[PDB]
C-alpha cells in the first residue's frame, strides 16, 4: 500500500519512486555504514595481517615478533 511520501512518475501512483527511493536511501547510507565499518575493518586487519605475514618475515627475518598494532 502507498501513502507515505507518495510521488508521481508517469501517470500512476508511484511504485517506482517508493521502493526505488527507499532502496537507494539505504543503498547510499546503509552502504557507507557496514562498507566502511565492516570492509574498512576487514581491509584494515586482513590487509595489516597479510602485510605482516609476507614481508616482515624476510624483511625482518622474524615470524610473529612483529605484528600490526596500528
Curated annotation (Swiss-Prot):
One of its GO terms (biological process) is photosynthesis. InterPro entries: Intrinsic_membrane_PufX (IPR020169). It is found in: Cell membrane. Its main location: membrane. The keyword Membrane applies. GO terms for cellular component: plasma membrane. Keywords: Cell membrane, Membrane, Photosynthesis. Pfam families: RhodobacterPufX. Belongs to the PufX family. Associated with the reaction center - light-harvesting complex I. May play a critical role in facilitating the interaction between this complex and other components required for light-driven cyclic electron transfer. This is Intrinsic membrane protein PufX. It comes from Cereibacter sphaeroides (strain ATCC 17023 / DSM 158 / JCM 6121 / CCUG 31486 / LMG 2827 / NBRC 12203 / NCIMB 8253 / ATH 2.4.1.). The lineage of its organism: Bacteria, Pseudomonadati, Pseudomonadota, Alphaproteobacteria, Rhodobacterales.
